[PDB]
């Protein structure tokens, strides 16, 4: 209907703003070494395993007979595996450093990674009382923001993968391609053939605005971390 | 009122049941070295900094002008400091080990610490749409569970503190005494609950103790799976 078309169009408008943030202009800048552009990588530690748990324990409901919830369950099974790819590339990039346990805790719970650390928390709280069709809007918005980030990160990641002859799995075109999905339908196909009540329309606008605001807060922390480390880089080793 | 009095009574009944859990009988058992009884200490890594955040970001509302919310805000300023004491005692016990960054992440996000890691998350979801007096019930319940655990942990804690002449701050009587030190139960004792608030307050107390019980189950399972990894304190 006209409601759902406004919702999907809001997601495109937010994606077009999000794509233009300075972080992504930096990450895409082929005049800076890919090792310097990926100095933000360790910041994702505060997010990636929280995102696995969001999929496993918040999005998923294994007991639902609901049409929409079953499609969510299939998609979130796959999306909850990507944290291992994060750990794989953490090691390849030279960021899996020996440190005290307390240094790792103080890093993850840094005040400079608050928005990074709480993006999944915020989504879980938003998602607590949503019917399955409305959870599909959360997931579609969140996945749209993720695909912008990983399409950008895969640029320096693929440069290092080629130069070192190593297979990257997280900052990699393979992650973007598996995430987009191409069996079971994509959520965007389901949403395109669903009509929203006026109440669902106003809730879906709140959802899209929040997911993009929280994602922009995360990207702002990445930008400030990069600025505090431009004198630092990833330390990949050539195979 | 009969309502509030029923809620303060249910907190004492849940406290009495919680105190009996097998983990606490183990931690109190002075025939076991206190280094073995604190094998569970690193598990608290998946909780203590989440609890700091619960107090800073979820319980606290610096935009609020309400009377009860202002009392909560003040309470949260104290409780948001105890994570540093956790990190102090981690180092003293020999648990602040050098490891790969990925080994620290895999520890905190272990499936065997799921309930530990999600306790504050669960409290934040429970609390996010509560009026302030109902947030006070969550805080009083959660503090009641915490007082049971730190009363028990302070036994092996203060044994090691005296034996090594070091100042322990988290598994210590100073922590137990500051928890106790207007206080919230005073306000609750003088506050009248609608039937709706009484039904919700029952749910809040049941959930706080069920989630705390889940956490304590994981601590007990951890000790049984890591029976060699005793604390390694050093004499001063
Ligand atoms: N594809 C991501 C998940 C993701 C989905 N949306 C995101 C937004 C921001 C950040 Br950082 C990450 C994401 C993953 O596998 O961790
Ligand atoms: N006094 C504790 C807080 C606390 C309050 N309730 C608790 C329940 C379980 C565990 Br483990 C800890 C708590 C602290 O300062 O971290
Ligand atoms: Fe992913
Ligand atoms: Fe405390
Ligand atoms: Ni998918
Ligand atoms: Ni630095
Ligand atoms: Ni809500
Ligand atoms: Ni307190
Ligand atoms: Ni282990």
Q: Would the annotation count A82 as a binding residue?
A: yes
Q: What is the DSSP letter of A81?
A: T
> What separation in Å is there between the alpha carbon of B186 and the centre of ligand 1?
45
Q: Would the annotation count A85 as a binding residue?
A: no
**Contact indicator for A88, B88 with CB cutoff of 8 Å:** no
**Contact indicator for B205, B145 with CB cutoff of 8 Å:** no
Q: How many CB atoms lie within 10 A of CB A178?
A: 16
CA dihedral B40, B45, B48, B52 (to 10 degrees): 180
Q: What is the DSSP letter of A41?
A: G
Residue from the list A87, A105, A128 with its beta carbon closest to the beta carbon of B45: A105
Token pair for B167: 């100042």
A187 alpha carbon, closest ligand:
5
CA distance B160 to B164: 6
Of all protein residues, the one whose alpha carbon is nearest to atom 9 of ligand 1 is: A146
In Å, what is the CA distance from A34 to each residue of A12, A23, A152, A173, A217?
Answer: 28, 14, 12, 15, 24
Q: Which is nearest to A120 in space by CA: A97, A98, A145? A: A145
Q: Does A124 touch chain B (CB under 8 A)?
A: yes
CA distance B197 to B203: 10
A239 lies in some domain: no
Token pair for B122: 């669960």
B61 lies in some domain: yes
In Å, what is the CA distance from B167 to each residue of A87, A100, B86?
Answer: 37, 21, 12
CA distance B219 to B116: 8
B236 lies in some domain: no
Q: Residue A47: CB within 6 Å of ligand 1?
A: yes
Of all protein residues, the one whose alpha carbon is nearest to atom 12 of ligand 1 is: A146
CA distance A184 to A69: 13
Instruction: Please tell me what resolution, in angstroms, this structure has.
Output: 1.7
What values do phi and psi take at A188, rounded to 5?
A: -60, -35
Of all protein residues, the one whose alpha carbon is nearest to atom 16 of ligand 1 is: A48
Domain count, chain B: 1
A160 lies in some domain: yes
Contacting B residues, span 56-115, partner chain A, CB-CB under 8 Å = 57, 83, 87, 90-91, 95-102, 104-109, 114
Token pair for A134: 């409305």
A238 lies in some domain: no
> What separation in Å is there between the alpha carbon of A131 and the centre of ligand 7?
13
Q: Give me the domain span that covers residue B87.
A: 2-225
A94: left (phi over 0), alpha (psi -120 to 50) or beta: left
- The secondary structure of B63-107 as a DSSP string is T---HHHHHHHHHHHHHTTHHHHHHHHHHHTT---EEEHHHHHHH
The experimental method behind these coordinates is X-ray
CA distance A46 to A116: 6
Q: Which is nearest to B131 in space by CA: B72, B182, B76? A: B72
Q: Output the CA torsion sign for A105, A108, A112, A118.
A: negative
Q: Residue B212: CB within 6 Å of ligand 2?
A: yes
Q: Would the annotation count A214 as a binding residue?
A: no
Q: Does A45 touch chain B (CB under 8 A)?
A: yes
- Tokens 């905190």 correspond to B108
Kindly list the residues from chain B whose CB atom is less than 8 angstroms away from the CB atom of residue A108: 49, 105, 108
Instruction: Give B190: exposed, middle or buried? Use CB within 10 Å, 0-12, 13-18, 19+.
Output: exposed
Beta carbons within 8 Å of A143's beta carbon, 6+ residues apart: A79, A179, A187
Q: Would the annotation count A179 as a binding residue?
A: yes
Chain-chain contact of A53 with B117 (C-beta, under 8 angstroms):
yes
**Contact indicator for B217, B115 with CB cutoff of 8 Å:** yes
Token pair for B17: 């049941």
**Contact indicator for B61, B69 with CB cutoff of 8 Å:** yes
Beta carbons within 8 Å of B101's beta carbon, 6+ residues apart: A42, A45, A90, A95, A96, A97, A99, A104, A107
A117 lies in some domain: yes
Q: Residue A223: CB within 6 Å of ligand 1?
A: no
Q: Residue A149: CB within 6 Å of ligand 1?
A: yes
Token pair for A130: 């949503």
CA distance B66 to B63: 10
In Å, what is the CA distance from B180 to each residue of A22, B121, B205?
Answer: 49, 24, 19
CA distance B44 to B136: 24
Look up the CATH number of the domain holding residue B81: 1.20.910.10
Bridge partners of B98, per DSSP, are A100
B162 lies in some domain: yes
Kindly list the residues from chain B whose CB atom is less than 8 angstroms away from the CB atom of residue A91: 102
Q: Which is nearest to B46 in space by CA: B105, B124, B95, B108? A: B108
CA distance B44 to B148: 15
Q: Residue B53: CB within 6 Å of ligand 2?
A: no
Contacting A residues, span 185-204, partner chain B, CB-CB under 8 Å = none
Q: How many CB atoms lie within 10 A of CB B16?
A: 10
Q: Output the CA torsion sign for B219, A113, A96, B83.
A: negative
CA distance B35 to B38: 5
CA distance A164 to A78: 28
Angle between helices B173-180 and B132-164 (to 10 degrees): 160
CA distance B214 to A44: 29
**Contact indicator for B140, B11 with CB cutoff of 8 Å:** yes
CA distance A210 to A84: 27
B234 lies in some domain: no
CA distance A220 to A208: 18
Helices (H) and strands (E) counted in chain A, each on its own, are 12, 1
> What separation in Å is there between the alpha carbon of A169 and the centre of ligand 3?
10
Size of interface A-B (CB pairs under 8 A): 79
> What separation in Å is there between the alpha carbon of B77 and the centre of ligand 8?
9
First to last CA, chain A: 54
Token pair for A160: 């290092």
CA dihedral A56, A58, A63, A66 (to 10 degrees): -120
Kindly list the residues from chain B whose CB atom is less than 8 angstroms away from the CB atom of residue A57: 114, 118
Q: Would the annotation count A175 as a binding residue?
A: yes
**Contact indicator for A45, A96 with CB cutoff of 8 Å:** no
Beta carbons within 8 Å of B155's beta carbon, 6+ residues apart: B27, B28, B30, B34, B37
Of all protein residues, the one whose alpha carbon is nearest to atom 12 of ligand 2 is: B146
């Amino acid at each position: 209907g006209a409601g759902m078309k406004a919702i999907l169009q809001l997601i495109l408008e937010k994606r077009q703003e999000f794509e233009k943030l300075p972080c992504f202009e930096f990450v895409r800048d082929e005049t800076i070494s890919p090792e310097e552009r990926l100095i933000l990588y360790p910041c994702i530690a505060a997010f990636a395993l929280n995102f696995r748990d969001l999929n496993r324990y918040d999005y998923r409901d294994d007991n639902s007979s609901d049409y929409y919830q079953k499609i969510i369950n299939i998609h979130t099974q796959e999306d909850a595996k990507h944290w291992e790819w994060f750990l794989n590339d953490l090691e390849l990039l030279g960021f899996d450093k020996t440190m005290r346990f307390s240094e790792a805790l103080r890093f993850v719970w840094s005040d400079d990674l608050l928005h990074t650390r709480r993006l999944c928390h915020n989504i879980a709280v938003l998602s607590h009382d949503l019917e399955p069709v409305m959870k599909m809007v959360v997931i579609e918005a969140m996945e749209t923001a993720g695909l912008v980030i990983f399409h950008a990160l895969a640029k320096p990641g693929e440069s290092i993968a080629k130069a070192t002859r190593r297979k990257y799995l997280y900052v990699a075109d393979s992650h973007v391609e598996v995430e987009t999905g191409h069996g079971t339908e994509n959520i965007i196909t389901i949403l395109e053939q669903t009509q929203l009540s006026s109440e669902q329309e106003e809730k879906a606008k709140e959802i899209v605005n929040k997911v993009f605001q929280w994602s922009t807060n995360l990207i702002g922390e990445f930008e400030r971390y990069v600025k505090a480390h431009r004198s630092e880089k990833a330390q990949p080793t050539a195979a």
